[PDB]
Amino acid sequence: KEKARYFTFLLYPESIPSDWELKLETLGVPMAISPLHDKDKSSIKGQKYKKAHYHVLYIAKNPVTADSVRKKIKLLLGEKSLAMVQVVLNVENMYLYLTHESKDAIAKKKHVYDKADIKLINNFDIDRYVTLDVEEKTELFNVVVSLIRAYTLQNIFDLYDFIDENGETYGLTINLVNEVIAGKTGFMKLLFDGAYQRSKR
Amino acid sequence: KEKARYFTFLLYPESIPSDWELKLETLGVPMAISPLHDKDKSSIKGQKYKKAHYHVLYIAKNPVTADSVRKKIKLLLGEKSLAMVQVVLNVENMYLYLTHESKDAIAKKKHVYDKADIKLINNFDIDRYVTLDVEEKTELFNVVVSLIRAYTLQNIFDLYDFIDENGETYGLTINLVNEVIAGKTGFMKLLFDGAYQRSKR
Amino acid sequence: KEKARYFTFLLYPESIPSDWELKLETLGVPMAISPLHDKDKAHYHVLYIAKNPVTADSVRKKIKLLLGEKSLAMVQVVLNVENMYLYLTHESKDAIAKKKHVYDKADIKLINNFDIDRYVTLDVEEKTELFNVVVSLIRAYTLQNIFDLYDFIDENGETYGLTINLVNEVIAGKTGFMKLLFDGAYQRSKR
Amino acid sequence: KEKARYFTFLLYPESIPSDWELKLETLGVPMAISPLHDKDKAHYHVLYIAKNPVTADSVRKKIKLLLGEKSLAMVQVVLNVENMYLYLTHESKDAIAKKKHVYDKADIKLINNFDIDRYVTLDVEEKTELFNVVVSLIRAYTLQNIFDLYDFIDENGETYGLTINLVNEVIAGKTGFMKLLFDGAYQRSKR
Amino acid sequence: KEKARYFTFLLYPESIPSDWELKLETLGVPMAISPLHDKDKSSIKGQKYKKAHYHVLYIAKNPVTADSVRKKIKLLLGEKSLAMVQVVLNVENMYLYLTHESKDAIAKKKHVYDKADIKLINNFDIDRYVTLDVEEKTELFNVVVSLIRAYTLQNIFDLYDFIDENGETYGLTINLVNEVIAGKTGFMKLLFDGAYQRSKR
Amino acid sequence: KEKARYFTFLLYPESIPSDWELKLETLGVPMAISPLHDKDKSSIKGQKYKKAHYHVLYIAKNPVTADSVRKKIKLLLGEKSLAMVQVVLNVENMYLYLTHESKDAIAKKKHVYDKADIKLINNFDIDRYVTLDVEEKTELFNVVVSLIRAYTLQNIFDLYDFIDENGETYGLTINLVNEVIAGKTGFMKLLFDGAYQRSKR
Ligand SMILES: [Ba+2]
Ligand SMILES: [Ba+2]
Ligand SMILES: [Ba+2]
Ligand SMILES: [Ba+2]
Ligand SMILES: [Ba+2]
Ligand SMILES: [Ba+2]
Ligand SMILES: [Ba+2]
Ligand SMILES: [Ba+2]
Ligand SMILES: [Ba+2]
Ligand SMILES: [Ba+2]
Ligand SMILES: [Ba+2]
Ligand SMILES: [Ba+2]
Ligand SMILES: [Ba+2]
Ligand SMILES: [Ba+2]
Ligand SMILES: [Ba+2]
Ligand SMILES: [Ba+2]
Ligand SMILES: [Ba+2]
Ligand SMILES: [Ba+2]
Ligand SMILES: [Cl-]
Ligand SMILES: [Cl-]
Ligand SMILES: [Cl-]
Ligand SMILES: [Cl-]
Ligand SMILES: [Cl-]
Ligand SMILES: [Cl-]
Ligand SMILES: [Mn+2]
Ligand SMILES: [Mn+2]
Ligand SMILES: [Mn+2]
Ligand SMILES: [Mn+2]
Ligand SMILES: [Mn+2]
Ligand SMILES: [Mn+2]
């Protein structure tokens, strides 16, 4: 059958032990658990809210079979805990989808939840799953350049500060400016020398 | 088998979900999708136009196997969505080939489509994937040198400014000067120190 | 073909010279040898630390020639050193969960000054995490050079997870980037 | 397994599509194609310039898929580009010495803006020769920066074998070393 | 087969020209030649000492094949000079083993020879071929840091001087500090800038 | 049979065309030809000088058989030109041996000739055959350090100058200092900064 690392599935509060949150920790795999979903618009007649459930993002350590994860949770939480496991094609999406903040979920105007009710098991960090491919770097690098040139930023700090305010405007966060100007260090020096000399005239 | 970043393949409107354009977005990979191909001269007897189809240009983030992308789309859009995935040798061509405006496609006098019906998923920008073959770089580098020497440009800025005006004259745009002087950083420093010392006398 | 520093493999008392423990020493590479495994045929687990990235098969041969072609038939690349080492006494997480026979830490044979504390580096994704931290730090407290940063570390290290030899391991190669940060701070302190 | 930029191979008119000349263009790599060789079976010699170091077999496949598996069966790595190019018209030194039939330079098919003048670099041992020269020069005439050196080159280039784009090709990567030389000269001019 | 830099092999006085010691010099490779081995305990019945022989430690300049060195010596000294060439895994050991002072040789209580009868051809210096395994470097590097920090050494010289006096205390000799701070150049600059700024306050 | 790149052999003025020096050039291989040997002490009774001859150092472009070179010269210069071809084990030696300035030739107190009468065919340069193996570099590097430290040389020039005078004392020539401090650029900077600061106090 098929194998993969990224899975997702549903957990209903009614069908799971009261210590599930700890029982899942025991698997030693990283997971992300949605805030509780208790506000999903039910197209069912005479009912506003779908039964309450949790979405679980589950990250095997090695390529395995969907059914291997099915069993592993049935044994952990009882056979009535889950009945449907799916392979995650894109992790970033399925994760935003936890709070209905993914592109598909906003376009279907679904109820938005709170990022803070998200339960991170086993040091799960979404970023250790979001890579910034080559071409994306150099794009932004040129941006950082247009920026340092435009606003005559004279050092790594002034740039950082500028980012702190207008970050979202150009798509930039601090740890991204750090990831971007990685290794381009020398080039950066050139840009600040430039700006600094220019501010002088 | 083989691994690579650049792929292409075919999508038939009849075999794909009505939300495919969004489903592909979910993969978080950049793609370029042809205008609809509904005008391809069919050498089949009794038929003017090949079945209607879409060409998809697909840019993995990391070298992967053709079959890995086959599966990924079969699961996304249904096993009847594609049956043939190919490795793209030249991105620039296979992209022009989307509107039958590539050299091969003009020489086979194939129906030309409209550039504007091209669907760009995930901030795909063709300019990202065309890059200066080696010899091209060093040519221009020598140019940037003739330039910094000739006009006594004393820093990355003055050079940039000069480029802003006389760019086309020498073939240079800003993001090209950036692509060119990549890694030659050190060498650049030498040139500016030169110019700056020289302006002083 | 793959190259790496960390390997492991099996040695059977029946198939090895009676002076193997010394013969391995001769390779001048650091190794850790399990207590004898006789409670799982009796065998030894060997943790082997090349000095330079090499091929699994290069180590296969090197031991076949050293101890005889019947000494080992399977060499593996070690992904995590800390684990594969605990696994020597079946005290690794995987080995406790499979309730395997636990051995004695003291029967472990350390060849060529092998010290487990040594081969613990930061996996990639860990370095850059901390690097960003060192940045948030140098930015926040306007540290103007490698020293002021060091000092700051000396006091509030544990707060941010940093020790001196970690700051050193972290800012490895990021040298240039660091220069940018101090120039920054120093200019900023001036205004 | 070996990687390189420069390859050559054979194409037989009998085994290739009638649009091959265009099909090769599609690869977006620069090539030089011999006039037809029918005076030595009739064949074409192809000079092929990968954009990045790759494996001979990677190019084998790439052409088998492009032109059909019967198009080529032998791909070779080009050691010297200038020669293998002259060898297209049997005007290379080896080909004149074996008195082989000479063809016409004009029947040569240049795909994708291939220009022979482009792929002539300095072999290793040649660079460092000249580098030492640039050093003897910067030392001798106390040139105090990349400019003064450039200027000097502009006048006495031919004397030492140097042109500007060669000084650029030479001092490639030796950047740092160059800095040392100018600091030197500049300090020395001061005394 | 295999390529490597470090080899060893045997030379019998009976089978070699009387000018061998000079003939080997001619190869322009560094070698170390054992004192004469004429005292090796022979397990052969009726004989105390193995035939007399020399051990040769041979250091190619570039990775080559064992057989390439076999030939090279057969041609130099005659085909009856050597019949067995081996790749040296550890140079430091195989060198001590020249005087039977290696760990293996002491444990097998073999006859110990004199260090002074060792013939060094072509400026062979054992210290050249013993080198700090990775972890060893970085240990000492941190030391050099603790040092430059502790005593506020403001440049490569002051550090050097300090080493000249208190070397042994920290395990450091000059050519070791040089071997250690190899490539860490940049990092070193940071440390001196630090110290120097700090001395100012 | 055996194959190799480096050969040597003898040419007698009496047995060779008067245009030999040009005929050899025609082979397009690099060679080095001794000054004329007309002063070799003949152990023959009643004769001071061996018949006059030339030594030829010959560098095939590809591994070939000694006999292949035998023929190639017999056809070029006539079958009476040479009767003995040998494989060169060490090029540097066999070349010094051209003027009897090799170690073996000095030890046999043989007549020394003039380096300038050496005939270099086809751009033969002995150095393109003399490599400086790793350990040799770093040895000398430490030397350059002991030197820059000792004499407080404050820049690449002062070092160069010092080399010009005391070169041979430490084994150093200019193009060797250049080959040595290759890539160690940064480290060098450290040394000059050091010296320069130190001269100030
Ligand atoms: Ba219940
Ligand atoms: Ba309702
Ligand atoms: Ba990341
Ligand atoms: Ba992304
Ligand atoms: Ba903010
Ligand atoms: Ba349908
Ligand atoms: Ba571009
Ligand atoms: Ba404009
Ligand atoms: Ba050791
Ligand atoms: Ba092009
Ligand atoms: Ba004898
Ligand atoms: Ba040493
Ligand atoms: Ba002392
Ligand atoms: Ba005659
Ligand atoms: Ba006599
Ligand atoms: Ba050389
Ligand atoms: Ba040498
Ligand atoms: Ba002199
Ligand atoms: Cl960096
Ligand atoms: Cl760069
Ligand atoms: Cl570093
Ligand atoms: Cl460069
Ligand atoms: Cl260095
Ligand atoms: Cl350099
Ligand atoms: Mn939901
Ligand atoms: Mn089509
Ligand atoms: Mn076991
Ligand atoms: Mn031909
Ligand atoms: Mn012995
Ligand atoms: Mn002679």
Q: Do the Cβ atoms of C175 and E189 come within 8 Å?
A: yes
Quick check: helix, strand or coil at residue D191?
coil
Using a CB–CB cutoff of 8 Å, tell me whether F187 touches chain E.
yes
Residues of B in contact with D168 (CB under 8 A): 138, 141-142, 145, 187
Among C144, F145, C142, D176, which Cα is nearest to E193's?
Answer: C144
Would you give the end-to-end CA distance of chain F in angstroms? 68
| Residue A65 burial by Cβ neighbours in a 10 Å radius (0-12, 13-18, 19+) | middle
Residues of C in contact with A157 (CB under 8 A): 139, 184-185, 187-188
| Domains of chain E in sequence order | 1-134 (3.40.1310.30), 135-201 (1.10.10.1480)
Q: Name the closest residue on chain D to residue B150, using Cα atoms.
A: D147
Measure CB to CB from residue F190 to each of E22, E28, E156 and give the nearest one. E156
Look up residue C14 and give its two tokens: 């029946």
Q: Measuring CA to CA, how many Å separate C15 from each of C38, C61, C64? A: 15, 15, 11
Q: Would you put residue D73 in left (φ > 0), alpha (ψ -120 to 50) or beta?
A: alpha
Using a CB–CB cutoff of 8 Å, tell me whether D76 touches chain F.
no
The residue with tokens 């080159």 is: D153
How remote is the C-alpha of B66 from its chain's centroid? 19
Q: Do the Cβ atoms of D175 and B186 come within 8 Å?
A: yes
Among D11, D64, D20, which Cα is nearest to D42's?
Answer: D11
Quick check: helix, strand or coil at residue B75?
helix
For residue C114, report the distance from its CA to the centre of ligand 29, in Å.
29
Instruction: Indicate the length of chain F as a whole number.
Output: 201
How close A158 gets to chain C, by Cα (Å)?
8
- In this structure, the number of other CB atoms found within 10 A of the CB of residue B87 comes to 18
Give the separation between CA F55 and CA F10, rounded to whole angstroms.
Answer: 5
Q: Measuring CA to CA, how many Å separate E118 from each of E86, E98, E127? A: 20, 8, 15
Quick check: helix, strand or coil at residue A63?
strand
DSSP-derived letter for residue C43 is B
Q: Would you put residue E171 in left (φ > 0), alpha (ψ -120 to 50) or beta?
A: left
Find out whether E35 and E99 touch, Cβ atoms under 8 Å.
yes
Find out whether C43 and E105 touch, Cβ atoms under 8 Å.
no
Using a CB–CB cutoff of 8 Å, tell me whether E115 touches chain C.
no
Q: Do the Cβ atoms of F90 and E27 come within 8 Å?
A: yes
CB neighbours of D142 closer than 8 A, spacing ≥ 6?
D185, D188, D189
How close A103 gets to chain B, by Cα (Å)?
8
The DSSP bridge partners found for residue D77 are D7
Experimental method: X-ray
By the CB criterion, residues less than 5 angstroms from ion ligand 22 are B 184, 187; D 172-173, 175
- In this structure, the number of other CB atoms found within 10 A of the CB of residue A105 comes to 17
DSSP, residue by residue, A65-93: -HHHHHHHHHHHH-TTS-S-EEE-S-HHH
Half-sphere exposure of D101 (CA within 13 A, CB side): 9
Instruction: Indicate the length of chain B as a whole number.
Output: 201
Give the separation between CA F184 and CA E183, rounded to whole angstroms.
Answer: 8
Give the separation between CA A18 and CA A27, rounded to whole angstroms.
Answer: 17
Give the separation between CA A177 and CA A155, rounded to whole angstroms.
Answer: 13
The residue with tokens 């060997």 is: C46
Q: Measured at the alpha carbon of residue B112, what is the angle toward residues B111 and B114, in degrees to the nearest 5?
A: 140
Residue A26: phi and psi, rounded to 5, are -55, -25
Half-sphere exposure of F200 (CA within 13 A, CB side): 10
Look up residue A125 and give its two tokens: 């960090």
Measure CB to CB from residue C180 to each of A128, A156, A174 and give the nearest one. A156
How close D145 gets to chain B, by Cα (Å)?
5
Look up residue C180 and give its two tokens: 């940018």
Q: Are strands A4-11 and A85-87 parallel, antiparallel or unpaired?
A: antiparallel
Find out whether C88 and C49 touch, Cβ atoms under 8 Å.
no
The residue with tokens 């800025």 is: B157
How remote is the C-alpha of D151 from its chain's centroid? 27
Find out whether F197 and E157 touch, Cβ atoms under 8 Å.
yes
Cβ-Cβ contacts under 8 Å between A and B: the total is 72
Give kind and range of the element (H or E) at residue E164: helix E156-170
Largest CA distance in chain D: 75
The DSSP bridge partners found for residue A57 are A8, A32
